Specification:
- This is part of a larger assembly, with chains A, B, C, D, E and F.
- Chain B is an alpha+beta fold.
- Chain B is built from six helices and eight strands, in the order H-E-E-E-E-H-H-E-E-E-E-H-H-H.
- By secondary structure, chain C is an all-alpha fold.
- Chain C has three helices and no strands.
- Chain C is elongated and about 90 Å long.
- Chain E is an alpha+beta fold.
- Chain E is built from five helices and seven strands.
- In chain E, the strands form two sheets. In chain E, strands 1-2-3-4 form a four-stranded antiparallel sheet. A three-stranded antiparallel sheet of chain E has the order 5-6-7, with helices on one face.
- Classes of the chains: A mainly alpha, B alpha+beta, C mainly alpha, D mainly alpha, E alpha+beta, F alpha+beta.
- Chains A and B meet through helix 2, helix 3 and helix 5 of A and helix 3, strand 8, helix 5 and helix 6 of B.
- The PDB classes it as cell cycle.
- The entry lists the keywords Chromosome, cell division, centromere, cell cycle.
Chain lengths: 103, 224, 103, 80, 198, 104
């Protein structure tokens, strides 16, 4: 009986403390969660993605640490991004695509 | 023959209802039976085609029903599915996986989930396209994976958002959202605060804060 | 007489535990919620002001030969994605054109 | 009909785009490594471009000839 | 006359429904509403089926079913019955398929490879906690515990293997226990036994 | 730990059933083998059947033991008593109607 009484009194003390703490924190968080949306709108029923997606390895670091010779590949990647041949090719591709979406 | 016409109409209505409820529209079906008895063993070759709301398929398999005194064991000994040759490589990868694993129900479940996520991405990309036609440039189309956000003021400062659909080894489907920043070195020599290299990670926090489309429109408004 | 006291104290402890559990979960989820909200707000404001002050430095020289950093190669590769997949894109349009002309 | 001339010019441009693709050996070196092809989504290889860009021609000509251009309510809206 | 074509249409739609039954889930319209049938299979081996009787009047209810008691059906119903009924059906399908696969793995391991097992293995109704000791033929006695913390999968979420009754004397035991842990964590239950038994 | 002298006997049988026989006693008496208590527990289910013999004196203790050993929080008694155990099993599990319409 003594050990059970000690356990339950410690538990209810911690419960009251944590209750007061969560109360004051919840009352405080409201002003900042309202100020965060001052210049931004508040908020299509799309389900929210799970935390496995948010904690998955991102794409940019994998690309950067996966390929060698960054600038040795950019040296003509920039040129082909400046070449108008591929630009006309992409315009043809996108024209064909929008023609397909029109039907 | 009015009762027969009523029965035909009722059966057609029930078929349409089941098709729009489950989500699979089935085509004709063929069956061939062979009696290979030694205790009895029968071989049934089935073939059927159909489609799921965007994707057509044609499958042909064969089962070996072993009927005996107390057990009736039915196992799919061989299966073969064929679909139209699109550009989705992970779809064919899962096709080969289900081919080598010889499973039928998991294939349909994964196909349903995949087409659901595909139509979700399609209806999400086209919505923000016409809403902000001056801040987004869909270079490949609404049925694609990439997305290009760019302002008409300067073609130098623009970035891309990536939306892919992944199918794991178990069979489940889960998407992934990343972004890649193509910004000239002028913005890097201008700003010494260095808040762009940590942009992807933080961006994920953003989409983990108040939604997906909300984060997208917030990024559009900030770049605007 | 003491047996019933033991029983009722056990009942009290068993009833009191899950409230503490739920309070702890609410607390340590609200903390990280607030932290993530603050971080997102800071990053968003920083990028907003950065682009706002950048909008005119490009206006000073309209078509200056701007180079690119190493972090831009992932987006460059995703732009060259369609460049190197134009073959599969024409395959797709041929398949869909036959599908259209199935009349 | 400007589609004819845009097709003509992209067909003439096919040769030089193949040239500027064969300019480098690094783009050929990244081939065979699926570690980038699964990330970009399908693959990065255009060597049969002759076949496809010459096959689209008869199909586009045929086109220009024929001129091809909650739960309760959702469930109740079906049984009707 | 028309009777031939009518019988042809009848047999055609009947065959179409019988083939639709093969997709994994089927349904039939009854007086109160729709009755759904869910089929289960693991690695091409067909297994038992279950039924669920629904009512269409608002709000949607469940007349009677054959789902086992330990399967959490009430939660899935309370969270998905009134919205996106097809998602509820597919979730129930996934749950039943995972349960059937785990039970089939356990039963096959118990039935086929009874020589390598010393005593009966411990198992719960939901089949989400396995524990068994085994000695393969020198003598290498191990004891393994497999826990499935995800009820939508057929592979254990964590596996631990220990050497009881015998201390660590050579690296062979270490490599064997490591390989056994990895094979239990990645490959199916009976497959690793059929692979390492030879 | 609650009482001092008490006999507990277990029998784990298929259908996922555990039969428990309890002979009660206290710090100053020996366990009485003439008035036992029988319990049938089904694993991973919220239901458990009991034989009403002598638990009217130790009902809260048995309830506490059942709700602690099975990792639960609360326990209540249903207004359903019967001598036929199979009928209670079919009613509680609501599996007395096993007829379903299907075309297969």
């Amino acid at each position: 009986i003594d050990k059970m009484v000690e356990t339950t009194e410690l538990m209810t003390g911690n419960i009251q403390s944590l209750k007061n703490k969560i109360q004051i924190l919840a009352s405080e968080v409201e002003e900042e969660e309202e100020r965060v949306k001052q210049m931004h709108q508040i908020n299509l029923s799309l389900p929210e993605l799970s935390q496995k997606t948010l904690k998955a390895p991102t794409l940019q670091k994998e690309i950067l640490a996966l390929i060698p010779n960054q600038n040795a590949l950019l040296k003509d990647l920039d040129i082909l991004h400046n070449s108008s041949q591929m630009k006309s090719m992409s315009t043809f591709i996108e024209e064909a695509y929008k023609k397909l979406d029109a039907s | 023959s009015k009762d027969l016409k009523n029965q035909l109409g009722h059966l057609e209505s029930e078929l349409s209802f089941l098709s729009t409820l489950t989500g699979i529209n089935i085509r004709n079906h063929s069956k061939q039976t062979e009696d290979l008895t030694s205790i009895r063993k029968v071989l049934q070759r089935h073939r059927l085609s159909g489609n799921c709301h965007m994707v057509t398929f044609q499958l042909e398999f064969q089962i070996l029903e072993i009927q005996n005194k107390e057990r009736l064991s039915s196992a799919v000994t061989d299966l073969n599915i064929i679909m139209e040759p699109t550009e989705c490589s992970e779809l064919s990868e899962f096709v080969s996986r289900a081919e080598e694993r010889k499973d039928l129900f998991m294939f349909f479940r994964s196909l349903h989930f995949f087409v659901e996520w595909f139509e979700y991405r399609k209806r999400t990309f086209k919505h923000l396209k016409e809403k902000y036609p001056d801040a987004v440039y869909l270079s490949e189309g609404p049925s694609s994976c990439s997305m290009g956000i760019r302002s008409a003021s300067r073609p130098g400062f623009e970035l891309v958002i990536v939306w892919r659909i992944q199918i794991d080894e178990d069979g489940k489907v889960f998407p992934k959202l990343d972004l890649l920043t193509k910004v000239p070195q002028r913005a890097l020599e201008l700003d010494k605060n260095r808040a762009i290299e940590t942009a992807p990670l933080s961006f994920r926090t953003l989409v983990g804060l108040l939604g997906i489309e909300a984060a997208l429109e917030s990024l559009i408004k900030s770049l605007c | 007489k003491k047996r019933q006291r033991m029983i009722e104290v056990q009942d009290e402890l068993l009833r009191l535990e899950p409230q503490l559990k739920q309070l702890q979960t609410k607390y340590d989820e609200l903390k990280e919620r607030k932290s993530s909200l603050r971080n997102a707000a800071y990053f968003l404001s920083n990028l907003k002001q950065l682009y706002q002050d950048y909008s005119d430095v490009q206006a000073q020289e309209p078509n200056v030969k701007e180079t690119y950093d190493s972090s831009s190669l992932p987006a460059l590769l995703f732009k060259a994605r369609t460049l190197l997949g134009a073959e599969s894109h024409l395959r797709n349009i041929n398949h869909q054109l036959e599908k259209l002309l199935d009349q | 009909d400007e589609f004819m001339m845009l097709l003509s010019k992209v067909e003439k441009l096919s040769e030089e785009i193949m040239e500027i693709m064969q300019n480098l050996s690094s783009i050929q070196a990244l081939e065979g490594s699926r570690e980038l092809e699964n990330l970009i989504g399908i693959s990065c290889a255009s060597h049969f471009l002759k076949r496809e860009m010459q096959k689209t021609k008869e199909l586009m000509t045929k086109v220009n000839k024929q001129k091809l251009f909650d739960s309760y309510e959702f469930l109740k809206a079906i049984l009707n | 006359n028309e009777q031939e074509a009518l019988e042809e249409k009848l047999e055609n739609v009947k065959a179409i429904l019988q083939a639709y039954h093969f997709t994994g889930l089927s349904g039939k319209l009854t007086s109160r509403g729709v009755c759904v049938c869910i089929s289960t299979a693991f690695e091409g081996n067909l297994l038992d089926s279950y039924f669920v009787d629904l009512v269409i009047q608002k709000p949607l209810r469940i007349h009677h079913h054959s789902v086992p008691v330990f399967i959490p059906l009430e939660e899935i119903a309370a969270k998905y019955l009134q919205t996106n009924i097809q998602h509820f059906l597919f979730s129930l399908c996934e749950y039943l398929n995972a349960y059937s696969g785990r039970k089939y793995q356990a039963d096959r391991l118990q039935s086929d490879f009874a020589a390598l097992l010393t005593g009966p293995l411990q198992r719960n109704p939901l089949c989400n906690l396995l524990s068994f000791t085994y000695k393969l033929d020198q003598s290498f006695p191990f004891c393994a515990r497999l826990l499935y913390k995800d009820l939508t999968a057929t592979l254990p979420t964590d596996v631990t293997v220990t050497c009881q009754g015998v201390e660590v004397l050579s690296t062979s035991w270490e490599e064997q226990r490591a390989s056994h842990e990895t094979l239990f964590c990645t490959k199916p239950l009976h497959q690793v036994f059929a692979s390492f038994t030879r | 730990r609650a009482l001092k002298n008490v006999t507990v006997s277990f029998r784990e049988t298929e259908e996922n059933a555990v039969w428990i026989r309890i002979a009660w006693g206290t710090q100053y008496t020996k366990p009485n083998q003439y008035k036992p208590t029988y319990v049938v527990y089904y694993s991973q289910t919220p239901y458990a059947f009991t034989s009403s013999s002598m638990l009217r004196r130790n009902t809260p203790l048995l309830g506490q033991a059942l709700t602690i050993a099975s990792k639960h929080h609360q326990i209540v008694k249903m207004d359903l008593r019967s001598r036929y155990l199979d009928s209670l099993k079919a009613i509680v599990f609501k599996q007395y109607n096993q007829t379903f319409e299907t075309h297969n």
